[PDB]
Amino acid sequence: LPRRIIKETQRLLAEPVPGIKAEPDESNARYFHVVIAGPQDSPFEGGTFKLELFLPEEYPMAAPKVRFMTKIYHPNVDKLGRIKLDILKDKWSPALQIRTVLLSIQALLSAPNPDDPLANDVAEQWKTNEAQAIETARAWTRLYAMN
Amino acid sequence: LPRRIIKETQRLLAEPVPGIKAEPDESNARYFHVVIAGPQDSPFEGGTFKLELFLPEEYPMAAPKVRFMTKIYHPNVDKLGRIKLDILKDKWSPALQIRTVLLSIQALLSAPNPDDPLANDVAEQWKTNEAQAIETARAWTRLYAMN
Amino acid sequence: MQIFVKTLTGKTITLEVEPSDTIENVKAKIQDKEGIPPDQQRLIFAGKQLEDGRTLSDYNIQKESTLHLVL
Amino acid sequence: MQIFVKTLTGKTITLEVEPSDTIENVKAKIQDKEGIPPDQQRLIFAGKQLEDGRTLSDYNIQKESTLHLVL
Amino acid sequence: QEHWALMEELNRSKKDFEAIIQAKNKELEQTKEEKEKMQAQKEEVLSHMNDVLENELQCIICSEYFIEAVTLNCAHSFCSYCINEWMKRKIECPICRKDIKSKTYSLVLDNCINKMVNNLSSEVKERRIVLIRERK
Amino acid sequence: PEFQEHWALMEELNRSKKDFEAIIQAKNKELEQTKEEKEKMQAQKEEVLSHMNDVLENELQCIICSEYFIEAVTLNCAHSFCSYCINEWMKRKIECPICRKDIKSKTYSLVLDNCINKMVNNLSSEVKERRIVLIRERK
Ligand SMILES: [Zn+2]
Ligand SMILES: [Zn+2]
Ligand SMILES: [Zn+2]
Ligand SMILES: [Zn+2]
């Protein structure tokens, strides 16, 4: 691997992000299995969410690929776990690094963006009935993210 | 003094140019008394030539001032010791430094430029009767530069 | 008083600040050190962003708190 | 063999050279270290400039001779 | 009586020898302390050296010490290779995202890196040579 | 009988003295080894000191002012200068002081400034304070 990938990979093992676990796949050195703790004071609090992260060939020129593997009720995460986050597409630059992405994803959980153009349909519920959406987020956390 | 002047002044004392002595004046820290040995295989060989060097206020934006104090027969040194050297006027840049000037002056002795536009009158003799001019240069070295 | 800012590259810088200083003011000091304009800085403390009109006192940021910088 | 070049600032660099190397060749190696193009370099040894087509052998420059660089 | 006197003299000599041994031990302890201080001084030096190495003269894109350092109009620097690859996709600084208006090679950065790296291990020097060749 | 007893005791004392002398010799050898180790350590650190004091002086100094670069600017020709120095130069000449190529661009360099601050930080407080004074003076 390029020095940077080696650098980040071992920084993850040595200096773990708070509330986030990130372990290398047993077969693919560019493939990581991530667990994000639901952020404090969020409707996801108490839950644990699986994510997978892949570093493409052209990384860091190309953005890392990230997807939720745990079902979650969130305006910026779709039914297949795909994440709507502009630093994963639009605002990606080689200086950002992996843990920036992971913290940003965690922050997305902490502060959802229902007003996003390419947002779910969950977004609409989040806009018009935020209280109900937050309870449903908590409901889905109970259902899918407690084991 | 500016750091650069301090830097060069002490470089002159610590790292002397071959065939060139350069000592600070006892009253003026920007004033230097220089002795240049006549270059090997030149008609000035064996002679020693006094020069004075002054670093103006605006140095290094402005060029150093240099003049011979020993009478010398040379196309690019006039009767008052003024030196015709383009890096002392035209091609002066703050990167050149003092010892570059001094070595260039020494090199001027080693290889005269009779074909210079603003050259003496000695130049004319140097152009038409180079052999005689070189003997006269040696004559003046005997007369003025051996003590 | 001093606070720490963890910059984009994960390095730490020290800022000289007062409790009365606004977030904009702190971002101005970050621009001077990192060259990132205030409108591109998002500062995070205790998992939440810090809004421009508010002060350090308002967010209970104190002596040697660490602020985190993202885009 | 190695030779020394005293650069514009009075610092010394070391060049890896051969007696057969031309002056142009030596100037190319100086450009790589100092970033001064060959046509702006005037190299001086024993009080005289070194002309571009000539070699180090032609100027009796040897092991650990020092060349002086001016503009 | 003479034998007893001789024995007493021998005992005194033994005591003197013991005192000398104690003094030697004290000197050895002092030497050890000095050695420890020297090690600490060298350790601090090593720390100062790993300072510029690891966070500093590194390109943010590749995390290697800059190879042919270039400086953009926005005052940020990158390897020539890394920024040239980046600019095949975006004409903006990877760090500050300002539009790139100029790209300038930096001799001072390159010479400083080359001179410092020349003092490090064979492993470090060789990696750099390989990376330059690969990029080439 | 107390005769041979006293003589025997004396012999034992002599043997003890010899053993003590041997121990002292061993201690001296150990001390010599320690001294050699200290010398080796000094050599290891001495080289670092030499590198440090040919590090921060020969490559980070502006040719115009002979100070470590203050607000480093890099020109199109790849040479660097203090911002203050090169601006004063450029009021008079538009050729690089070092290579004399016509100046076509300037850029500031955060990396050079940050590197220099880190290096200077390891120098004497005289050098550090001088740099502070120039920075404010040129400000
Ligand atoms: Zn790079
Ligand atoms: Zn930038
Ligand atoms: Zn300067
Ligand atoms: Zn230049």
Phi and psi, residue F61, nearest 5°: -110, 130
d(CA A83, CA A69): 11
Counting one residue from chain D and one from chain F, the pairs whose CB atoms sit within 8 A come to 22
Distance (Å) from the C-alpha of residue D6 to the closest C-alpha of chain E? 16
Gap between the Cα atoms of C41 and C7, Å rounded: 10
Map C4-32 to HEC letters.
EEECCCCCEEEEECCCCCEHHHHHHHHHH
Cα angle value B111/B113/B118 (rounded, 5°)? 150
CA–centroid distance, D7 to ligand 1, in Å, is 29
> For residues E109 and F111, is the Cβ–Cβ distance under 8 A?
yes
Cβ distance of E21 and F17 shorter than 8 Å: no
Residue numbers of the domain that contains A119: 3-144
Q: Please name every residue paired with A20 in a beta bridge, in sequence order, or none if there are none.
A: A36
Total number of domains constituting chain E: 2
| Tally of structural domains, chain D | 1
CA A69 to chain centre: 10
Element (H, E) at F32: helix F2-55
Q: Are strands A48-54 and A31-37 parallel, antiparallel or unpaired?
A: antiparallel
Task: Give how far Cα E102 sits from Cα of A93, E91, E92, E106, F104, Å.
Answer: 19, 11, 11, 13, 11
Q: How many C-beta atoms surround the C-beta of residue D23 within 10 A?
A: 22
Task: List the structure tokens of B115.
Answer: 């074909």
Q: Which of A40, A47, A42, A41 is nearest to A140 (CA)?
A: A47
Cα(E111) to ligand 1 centroid in Å equals 16
Question: Is E95 close to C35, i.e. CB distance below 8 A?
Answer: yes
Q: Which residues contact E13 (CB under 8 A, 6 or more apart)?
A: F17
Sheet harboring C48-49: ordered strands across?
C12-16, C2-6, C66-70, C42-45, C48-49
The CATH number for D16's domain is: 3.10.20.90
Residue closest to F19 by CA, chosen among A114, B45, E17: E17
CA-based end-to-end distance of chain F: 101
E92 and E43 together in one domain: no
- Residues F98 and F63: beta-carbon distance below 8 Å: yes
Cα–Cα distance list, D14 to B100, D4, D24, E25 (Å): 19, 5, 16, 50
CB contact under 8 A, C70 and A104: yes
**Beta-strand pair D12-16/C42-45:** unpaired
Query: Do F89 and F134 fall into the same domain?
Result: yes
Ligand 2 centre distance from Cα of residue E94 (Å):
7
Whether F124 is covered by a domain: the verdict is yes
- Considering the domain architecture, whether residues E2 and E50 belong to the same structural domain is answered as yes
Backbone angles phi, psi at E22, to 5 degrees: -65, -40
Hey, what are E41's tokens?
């001084």
- Do B76 and B85 form a contact (C-beta atoms < 8 A)? yes
| CA–CA dist F125, A83 (Å, integer) | 52
Sign of the Cα torsion B120, B126, B129, B134 reads: positive
Q: What residues of E are in contact with residue D33 (Cβ under 8 Å)? A: 111
Do F82 and F125 belong to one domain? yes
Q: Are B117 and B44 in contact (CB under 8 A)?
A: no
How far is residue B55's CA from residue B30's CA, in Å, rounded to a whole number? 5
Compute, in angstroms, the gap from residue B59 CA to the centroid of ligand 3.
Answer: 12
Solved using: X-ray
Ligand nearest to the backbone CA of E79: 1
Nearest by CB: A39 against C47, C68, C70: C47
Resolution for the entry shown, Å: 8.3
Q: How many residues does chain A have?
A: 147
* Residues in chain F closer than 8 A to D11 (CB atoms): 58
Ligand approaching nearest to the C-alpha of F97: 4
Rounded Cα distance, A32 and A51, in Å: 8
**Domain enclosing residue F37, as ranges:** 1-55
Contacts of F100 in chain D (CB under 8 A): 40, 71
Round to whole Å and give the CA distance between B111 and D54: 18
Helix pair F110-120, E107-117: axis angle to 10 deg = 40
F75 chain-D contacts, CB cut-off 8 A: none
User: Would residue E63 count as lying in a domain?
Assistant: no
Domain total in chain B? 1
Task: Return phi, psi of residue D39, to 5°.
Answer: -70, -15
Of the candidates A62, B130, B123, A91, the residue with the CA atom closest to the CA atom of residue E86: A62
Domain limits for position C35: 2-70
**Where residue F94 sits, what CATH number does that domain have?**
3.30.40.10
Chain E nearest-CA distance from A17, in A, is 19
Edge-to-edge strands, sheet with A65-68: A20-24, A31-37, A48-54, A65-68
Neighbours of chain E (3+ CB pairs under 8 A): A, C, D, F
Largest interatomic CA distance in chain C: 28
Q: Examine residue E62 and state whether it is found in any structural domain, yes or no.
A: no
Contacts of E94 in chain C (CB under 8 A): none
CA angle centred on E14, ends E10 and E16, rounded to 5°? 115
> Is F60 a member of any domain?
no
Q: Report which bound ligand comes closest to the CA of E94.
A: 2
Residue A94's CATH number? 3.10.110.10
Paired strand residues for B20? B36
The whole-angstrom separation of Cα E129 and Cα E3 is 81
Residue position matching structure tokens 């601006």: F87
